[PDB]
Design a protein around this ligand. Structure first.
Ligand code: BCL
Ligand code: BCL
Ligand SMILES: CC[C@H]1c2cc3[nH]c4c(c3C)C(=O)[C@H](C(=O)OC)c4c3nc(cc4[nH]c(cc(n2)[C@@H]1C)c(C(C)=O)c4C)[C@@H](C)[C@@H]3CCC(=O)OC/C=C(\C)CCC[C@H](C)CCC[C@H](C)CCCC(C)C
Ligand SMILES: CC[C@H]1c2cc3[nH]c4c(c3C)C(=O)[C@H](C(=O)OC)c4c3nc(cc4[nH]c(cc(n2)[C@@H]1C)c(C(C)=O)c4C)[C@@H](C)[C@@H]3CCC(=O)OC/C=C(\C)CCC[C@H](C)CCC[C@H](C)CCCC(C)C
Ligand SMILES: CC(C)=CCC/C(C)=C\CC/C(C)=C/CC/C(C)=C/CC/C(C)=C\CC/C(C)=C/CC/C(C)=C/CC/C(C)=C/CC/C(C)=C/CC/C(C)=C/CC1=C(C)C(=O)c2ccccc2C1=O
Ligand SMILES: COC1=C(OC)C(=O)C(C/C=C(\C)CC/C=C(\C)CC/C=C(\C)CC/C=C(\C)CC/C=C(\C)CC/C=C(\C)CC/C=C(\C)CC/C=C(\C)CC/C=C(\C)CCC=C(C)C)=C(C)C1=O
Ligand SMILES: COC(C)(C)C/C=C/C(C)=C/C=C/C(C)=C/C=C/C(C)=C/C=C\C=C(C)\C=C\C=C(C)\C=C\C=C(C)\C=C\CC(C)(C)OC
Ligand SMILES: CCCCCCCCCCCCO[C@@H]1O[C@H](CO)[C@@H](O[C@H]2O[C@H](CO)[C@@H](O)[C@H](O)[C@H]2O)[C@H](O)[C@H]1O
Ligand SMILES: CCCCCCCCCCCCO[C@@H]1O[C@H](CO)[C@@H](O[C@H]2O[C@H](CO)[C@@H](O)[C@H](O)[C@H]2O)[C@H](O)[C@H]1O
Ligand SMILES: CCCCCCCCCCCCO[C@@H]1O[C@H](CO)[C@@H](O[C@H]2O[C@H](CO)[C@@H](O)[C@H](O)[C@H]2O)[C@H](O)[C@H]1O
Ligand SMILES: CCCCCCCCCCCCO[C@@H]1O[C@H](CO)[C@@H](O[C@H]2O[C@H](CO)[C@@H](O)[C@H](O)[C@H]2O)[C@H](O)[C@H]1O
Ligand SMILES: CCCCCCCCCCCCO[C@@H]1O[C@H](CO)[C@@H](O[C@H]2O[C@H](CO)[C@@H](O)[C@H](O)[C@H]2O)[C@H](O)[C@H]1O
Ligand SMILES: [Ca+2]
Ligand SMILES: [Fe+3]
Ligand SMILES: [Mg+2]
Lengths: 46, 318, 47, 274, 268, 47, 47, 47, 48, 47, 47, 47, 47, 46
């Protein structure tokens, strides 16, 4: 990999933040999509 | 007029090559190698020796049983007439079991022989496959032949075993005959609505066309650069020569990109295996998960719609 | 967990991850477009 | 723009037409005079195909269909929207394919290579002109050519095949298919053979030479054709597949009109077993 | 749900097709990486390297050679100074030889820096040897023996006589023709098999019918008789080095453009 | 069980494991989609 | 605007341009021949 | 924005730009010719 | 000097290139005006 | 305009032109033959 | 007889034996499933 | 104009010219053979 | 006629002759079996 | 005419001539068998 431990931690810090930011935007998108049309049918089937 | 390297003009003769020494645990090679002049015109003149281990003899015996079952049944179908056997040979077949038996073991009268021939032929092919694996490993070479062979077996297995297993009927399988298995091939496409519209059949044909295209390119490319030692490909891979450079540059200047001497055989390997790999998947899909490929094409916007030169014909059966 | 980057190169992993994420997102969008309820372009009614 | 070994080979000469004027490169592509004509015919043919697609009912890639004219037009040029566009594209395709082959000749001459590749491509061109010129000419109408569409020409193949009630029984088709199957089988074997010696079973093992290549096939199937033979045989099988394909379709219609299984009654009616 | 259906419109065959498209795209990407193991990184016409990134250019492939020859690395950069000059200044222009391209190794005469050691059989002995160094090998009966025949140049003028045959031990085939030059400054010259045509009474359509050959001999259309003297000479005896093989075969490759000039200039 | 990494390279094991886990997950999601009961996009009624 | 010839070689540029101009010219002539109104050889009536 | 030419070769960018723009332009003309309303050679009536 | 043309050569080629381009365009403009006088290609609301 | 021969070598600019001119000439004769009015061989009434 | 193993290598015999036994076991299990009486998954009645 | 034969190969120029002349002559004869008026073998009546 | 053995190899010409004679004999027996009159195994009536 | 054997090998000519003679003889016999008049095995009326 040719990476020291210091750069490995520093990349992982940004990677986790970017993943959280990407997930947070997606979570909001899924909340908006659910408010539009929920995708869990239920006993009656939509 | 220059030499086109189509036929070897001057062959040389010497001691026959007995093959590289096999490691301990291998049978001695059988046969006394000899030289064939006409084979040496195109390639190597030496014929043999062959390796006949346990896998070789077991595969030969299993294949012999399957061929005998097929041949004796076709001979019996013409009342054991050798004259009618030769005359009708392309038309004769060992018929697959009747549809009434499903996956159950059928009697000899109604396709029991087909199941035995299929079983022993499959065992022969499988034993030949591991022999292909073993012969490569014992020489220290990679097992590329065995896995390319496995792709061919994959289509063979789905055609006669796996798809009939999924359809629950041995009658869905291929007869052991020359013309009848062409009839089965035609009937298969007809039954499932123009296998031309099977996308994996399209892929298999693209790779079959590509494989023939690639060998036309590669065979001509190597022959055109064999004057620089292009036929010694493995030597070119380890130590690149002007033959590899000219071969790559010709294709780079022609179509804008090229391969290496090693990577062209990776293209050759993958195009060949993908022919049977895609084909086996396509055959496995029809009847099990798609039953009318043309209607699948119209469903997915694949089938063109043609202008009506005649009014649409109503079906007279209501 | 930072030690994961001592195994895989971060830059090539990012390329593969971003390619994977876009392809997955495209196919999930297309899967929804293939349904009657979740096709926002065809706009079928619910229930 | 250049491969690490490319610079020495980028020399002048080897052209058939144009000489110095067109002897240059654009990126990796060599141009030559026939490259200009290839571009001319390719752009013209592609533009006319896209124009026919635009004027067609749909933009669906599978459903775009540039059909040939009706059989009633014979060998004349039909109106552009009634199959004439297909006729022009056919000429452009032939011009592009021949220019591509002649361009490959110039590149072959410039590198000191043999003319095997353009000659092998000529077999492919021969199959196309058999489908699109020779067979329509022998049948007396350009409408016998296959349409220019991804799925429409597959429908053409099906309907021509069933014009003889069983195209599998066509004798030249039987030979051509076997060659197509043989070259793919040979290609898989040849690609596997070269990869096996250059990639040994144990990683970081000595590379294997031609002796191991010969020994494996002698051990496996009892015969090894050698590095030179496999490329000769592979080219032969591929070209035989292309050649017998042209024969199989050119005898269907021009030289045989009934069901292809009928044709085998000569074998069944031989006086030795009649 | 229908048996093949997934989402009303989606079915198993469709998603199976898209699974293959993903695999095929990955395979094409993988195959193109293997294509870049030689000839890369790209360089400009003046030699300046081009930028390749990392997802395309793979790590160097190391082949361990047999016979204790060490390890070989794919993508070897040739070190000989190029005796060429760009005809024009714009990129994509041809290059002109600043000397004699036939002897300088330029264009069709270009030779790569192959190994300076002879190719060896698996046993460990020289693969390409003259017939004088191994009487166990002889020309096959039914094929004309080149030994003794006179070698003619492209212009039809005699260039020499065959003195010996150099054969490959692994593949029982003639690799080179040792030609004693008719013009002498005994200078011998190597003619590769692929650059010569044998015209004896045992080739074909002559053994089958029985017709004698009118003018039997070895015919080389690649080079004129005068250019035979400049064919690169092998350093040693009974042994030909792979680099020497490359230079001899490159010299013949450039003959059609630089010696006979039949490929030099447009046809019409 | 730490000894298992003395025989298997962590990098190739993780790549194979992640590829296997994702393919299995996609395979199981698609299998559910082919069932009437568990197709959450088509939303058939229970029982 | 003369500086465009310090980037584009006149020889290749003119060859590419003249080829492109010819392809486009006969392509447009073809398009008109394919139409009812602008087929000057067929001579269809206006309106 | 003069800094983009520190990154991108002006000659290669111009070649890529010109061919891309023409291909886009000709395909937009093609798309218009495929519509009833905007095919100027067919001249279909409005509405 | 990417193309090997000096500044004066680029001047001379451009002047002739512009002049012949103008001449080529002028002939095409006259051809289009004649074509328009023959059959205009802009339909109108009723589409001729 | 005599300067074009500095740029384009006339020794083979003519062959690239003659085979261009004939193919264009052979083709225009073809288009006329395809028409009802201008086919001088069939010779339809001019109306 | 212990002398059986002078003839045949223990390692190769075990590899072939294990494969042969499993293939035979699969063969017999499939044959039983092909019958009405011995298909334990289908569970047909007796008689 | 005799100088051009120093720049053109007299042999293969004559070969190509004869091939072109014969092909054109054959082609024109065939076009006449395909017409009802100029077919001198079918011999249809004038007018 | 004893001189034909100066040119023809007696061993090779006997093998070819015996192969030819047997093949000819088999086909003549074949042809007779194909006919109605001379099929001595079917034994059809004369006249 | 005795000089024709100066040009052609007598052995190869005789093999080719005998092969040609037999092939033609077989070919003519088969053609007669195909005709209704000269098929001596079927034996049709004149
Ligand atoms: C009317 C007929 C249908 C049609 C019906 C089918 C059917 C059915 C099938 C194909 C299949 C294929 N079709 Mg299709 N096909 C049609 C039209 C075409 C056209 C054309 C231009 O018209 C072409 C080029 C093709 C080409 C193809 C191939 C791409 C593909 C076969 C791959 C292959 O090489 O496996 C050939 C090799 C094997 C099958 C076996 C591989 C090796 C085995 C192990 C051999 C063992 C040898 C054995 C030991 C020898 C001893 C045996 C004993 C003596 C008995 N088809 C039309 C639409 N086609 C096959 C496929 O997979 O497509 C999806 C297939 O099953
Ligand atoms: C129901 C249909 C019938 C049938 C009816 C027909 C008909 C009709 C035909 C065939 C033809 C073929 N059939 Mg079939 N065939 C059937 C079933 C089969 C089966 C099978 C498994 O059952 C197989 C294996 C085949 C196999 C074959 C091949 C022998 C042949 C197709 C290859 C070919 O012609 O190459 C030759 C083709 C080429 C070389 C293509 C030419 C390429 C050109 C020169 C280059 C183009 C470049 C391109 C424009 C580049 C684009 C630019 C890109 C950006 C790069 N058929 C069934 C029974 N078959 C065809 C044939 O043999 O005709 C020649 C044919 O016409
Ligand atoms: C990538 C896909 C392509 C492909 C690849 C492929 N095929 C392969 C391989 C590969 C990579 C092999 O390695 C394998 C092989 O062995 O190649 C040389 C093979 C092979 N592909 C074959 C055929 C084949 N491949 C086909 C197709 C294809 N193969 C695809 C196009 C087809 C088609 C199109 O139908 C065929 C028919 C075989 C030649 C071979 C596998 C042979 C095999 O498994 O044989 C097992 C053993 C037997 C059946 C022995 C039977 C014959 C004996 C002579 C019996 C008799 C014994 C005794 C002599 C009796 C004596 C009696 C007398 C005393 C009377
Ligand atoms: C004869 C043996 C096999 C073979 C050989 C072969 N093909 C070859 C060669 C060789 C030796 C080349 O050197 C040449 C090449 O450059 O390969 C990369 C080539 C080639 N074979 C190709 C394709 C190809 N080969 C095929 C088949 C085969 N090629 C045979 C099986 C097929 C099939 C069966 O479908 C195809 C599609 C190309 C990739 C290439 C030739 C490229 C070329 O001609 O370039 C110039 C033209 C263009 C770039 C575009 C022209 C477009 C036209 C003006 C308009 C379209 C016309 C066409 C009729 C449309 C049809 C559409 C419908 C069918 C959907
Ligand atoms: C005239 C002018 C200049 C402008 C005009 C401008 C204009 C008109 C309009 C304006 C708009 C406009 C277009 C502008 C100008 C823009 C323009 C186009 C510029 C000029 C460009 C030019 C000069 C010419 C035209 C370029 C052109 C047509 C390209 C298409 C190329 C093509 C057909 C591709 C097919 C690809 C496929 C799928 C192939 C199947 C095989 C396969 C799967 C192969 C992989 C394995 C492999 C790599 C194998 C090889 C090999 C082998 C076989 C070995 O065996 C081997 C052995 C050992 C080593 C290596 C190898 C080895 O590599
Ligand atoms: C460079 O390495 C390699 C070798 O040797 C070092 C080899 O020998 C081989 C294997 C060589 C072979 C001869 C096996 C493949 C053989 C065939 C495909 C023969 C097919 C022959 C026919 C005549 C069938 C054609 C069709 C009809 C209808 C007849 C390979 C692949 C190789 O790659
Ligand atoms: C002395 O010898 C004489 C008789 C001459 C012998 C000569 C015999 C001759 C001339 C034989 C000719 C044979 C021919 C022409 C054969 C042609 C075969 C062809 C063309 C086959 C084509 C396709 C066939 C296929 C694809 C068949 C596939 C069958 C399969 C995969 C069967 C699998 C069956 C299995 C695995 C059975 C398992 C047993 C089970 C599990 C069911 O047990 C319960
Ligand atoms: C030294 C002190 C500073 C160190 C830390 C620096 C910042 C570290 C990362 C902070 C969070 C960034 O998080 C990143 O932001 C981008 C901004 O477009 C967002 O990305 C978002 O927009 C992009 C378009 O650009 C979309 O493709 C993506 O789908 C969406 O999520 C995500 O939220 C996340 O990918
Ligand atoms: C080589 C080994 C291949 C193994 C393939 C994987 C297992 C296949 O599993 C197999 O699937 C098929 C298809 O549903 C089932 O087949 C079953 O359903 C089909 C549906 O048409 C019925 O006609 C058939 O009577 C019945 O047996 C088998 O009961 C099952 O055992
Ligand atoms: C290249 C291959 C060789 C081409 C050289 C010419 C070969 C002979 C072809 O000759 C061609 O045959 C076709 C039919 O087969 C005939 O053309 C025929 O088609 C029309 C229908 O369109 C029929 O009504 C009519 O019987 C006849 O005119 C002509 O006789 C000729 O156009
Ligand atoms: C779908 C995603 C990619 O799918 C995967 O990509 C890899 C990329 O190497 C390719 O896999 C290929 O290369 C790998 C090495 O990487 C090799 O073992 C082999 O030559 C082949 O499997 C195939 O395309 C597929 O196995
Ligand atoms: C191979 C290369 C040659 C191919 C064969 C060409 C033979 C010429 O064959 C002849 O062509 C000309 C077109 O130029 C036709 O001539 C005329 O025919 C009909 C008459 O309405 C028109 O549609 C056609 O456009 C018109 O030119 C003849 O009807 C045809 O028989
Ligand atoms: Ca018949
Ligand atoms: Fe190869
Ligand atoms: Mg049947």
């Amino acid at each position: 990999t040719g990476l020291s431990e210091d750069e490995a931690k520093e990349f992982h810090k940004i990677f986790v933040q970017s993943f959280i930011g990407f997930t947070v935007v997606a979570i909001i998108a899924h909340l908006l999509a659910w408010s539009w049309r929920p995708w869990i049918p239920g006993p009656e089937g939509y | 007029s220059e030499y086109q390297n189509i036929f070897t003009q001057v062959q040389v003769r010497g001691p026959t090559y007995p093959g590289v020494p096999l490691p301990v645990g291998n049978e001695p090679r059988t046969g006394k190698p000899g030289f064939n002049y006409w084979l040496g015109k195109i390639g190597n003149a030496q014929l043999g020796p062959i390796y006949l281990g346990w896998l070789g003899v077991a595969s030969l015996l299993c294949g012999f049983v399957a061929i005998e079952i097929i041949g004796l049944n076709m001979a019996a179908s013409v009342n054991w007439s050798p004259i009618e056997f030769i005359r009708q040979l392309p038309w004769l077949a060992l018929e697959p079991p009747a549809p009434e038996y499903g996956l159950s073991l059928p009697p000899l009268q109604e396709g029991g022989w087909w199941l035995m021939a299929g079983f022993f032929l499959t065992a022969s092919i499988i034993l030949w496959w591991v022999r292909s694996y073993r012969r490569a490993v014992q020489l220290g070479m990679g097992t590329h032949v065995a896995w390319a062979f496995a792709s061919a077996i994959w289509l063979y297995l789905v055609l006669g075993f796996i798809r009939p297993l999924l359809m629950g009927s041995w009658a869905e399988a291929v007869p052991f005959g020359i013309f009848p298995h062409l009839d089965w091939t035609a009937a298969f496409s007809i039954r499932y609505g123009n296998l031309f519209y099977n996308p994996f059949h399209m892929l298999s044909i693209a790779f079959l066309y590509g494989s023939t295209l690639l060998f036309a390119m590669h065979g001509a490319t190597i022959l055109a650069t064999s004057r620089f030692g292009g036929e010694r490909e493995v030597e070119q891979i380890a130590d690149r020569g002007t033959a590899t450079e000219r071969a790559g540059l010709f294709w780079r200047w022609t179509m804008g990109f090229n391969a290496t001497m090693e990577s062209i055989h990776r293209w050759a390997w993958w195009f060949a295996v993908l022919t049977t790999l895609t084909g086996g998947i396509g055959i496995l899909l029809t009847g099990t998960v798609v039953d009318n490929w043309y209607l699948w094409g119209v469903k997915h916007g694949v089938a063109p719609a043609y202008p009506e030169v005649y009014p649409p014909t109503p079906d007279p059966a209501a | 967990m930072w030690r994961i980057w001592m195994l895989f190169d971060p830059r090539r992993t990012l390329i593969a991850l971003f390619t994977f994420l876009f392809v997955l997102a495209i196919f999930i969008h297309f899967i929804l477009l293939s349904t009657e309820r979740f096709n926002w372009l065809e706009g079928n009614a619910m229930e | 723009a250049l491969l690490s070994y490319e610079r020495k080979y980028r020399v002048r000469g080897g052209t058939l037409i144009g000489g110095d004027l067109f002897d240059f490169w654009i990126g990796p592509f060599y141009v030559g005079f026939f490259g200009v004509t290839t571009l001319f015919f390719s752009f013209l043919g592609t533009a006319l195909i896209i124009y026919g697609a635009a004027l067609g009912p749909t933009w669906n890639v599978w459903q775009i269909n540039i059909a040939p004219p009706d059989l009633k037009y014979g060998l004349g040029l039909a109106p552009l929207m009634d199959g004439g566009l297909w006729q022009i594209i056919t000429i452009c395709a032939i011009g592009a394919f021949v220019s591509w082959a002649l361009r490959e000749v110039e590149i072959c001459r410039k590198l000191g290579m043999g003319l095997h590749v353009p000659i092998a491509f000529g077999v492919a061109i021969f199959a196309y002109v058999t489908l699109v010129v020779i067979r329509p000419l022998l049948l007396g109408a350009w409408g016998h050519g296959f349409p220019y569409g991804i799925m429409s020409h597959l429908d053409w193949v099906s309907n021509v095949g069933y014009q003889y009630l069983h195209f599998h029984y066509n004798p030249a088709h039987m030979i051509a298919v076997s060659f197509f199957f043989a070259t793919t089988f040979a290609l898989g074997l040849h690609g596997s053979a070269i990869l096996s010696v250059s990639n040994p079973h144990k990683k970081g093992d000595p590379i294997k030479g031609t002796e191991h290549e010969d020994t494996f096939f002698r051990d496996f199937m009892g015969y090894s054709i050698g590095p030179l033979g496999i490329h000769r045989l592979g080219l032969f099988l591929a070209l035989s597949a292309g050649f017998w394909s042209a024969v199989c379709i050119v005898i269907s219609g021009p030289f045989w009109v009934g069901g292809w299984p009928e044709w085998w009654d000569w074998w069944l009616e031989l006086p030795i077993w009649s | 749900m229908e048996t093949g259906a997934l989402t009303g419109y989606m079915d198993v065959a469709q998603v199976t097709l898209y699974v293959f498209w993903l695999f095929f795209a990955g395979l094409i990407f993988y195959l193109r990486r293997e294509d870049r193991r030689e000839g890369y990184p790209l360089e400009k016409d003046d030699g300046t390297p081009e930028d390749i990134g990392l997802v395309w250019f793979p790590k160097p492939k190391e082949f361990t050679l047999p016979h204790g020859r060490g390890t070989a690395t794919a993508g070897r950069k040739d070190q000989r100074k190029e005796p060429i000059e760009k005809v024009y200044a714009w990129e994509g222009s041809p290059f002109e030889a600043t000397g004699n391209p036939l002897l300088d190794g330029v264009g069709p005469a270009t030779w790569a820096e192959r190994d300076d050691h002879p190719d060896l059989t698996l046993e460990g002995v020289n693969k390409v040897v003259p017939l004088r160094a191994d009487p166990d090998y002889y020309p096959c009966d039914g094929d004309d023996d080149p030994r003794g025949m006179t070698v003619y140049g492209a212009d039809g003028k005699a260039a020499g006589t065959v003195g010996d045959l150099w054969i490959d031990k692994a593949d029982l085939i003639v690799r080179y023709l040792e030609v004693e030059l008719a013009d002498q400054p005994k200078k011998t010259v190597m003619v590769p098999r692929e650059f010569m045509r044998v015209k004896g009474p045992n080739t074909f359509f002559n053994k089958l019918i029985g017709l004698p050959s009118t003018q039997p001999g070895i015919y080389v259309s690649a080079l004129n008789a005068e250019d035979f003297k400049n064919i690169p000479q092998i350093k040693g005896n009974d042994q030909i080095t792979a680099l020497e093989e490359e230079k001899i075969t490159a010299y013949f490759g450039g003959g059609r453009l630089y010696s006979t000039k039949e490929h030099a200039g447009p046809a019409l």
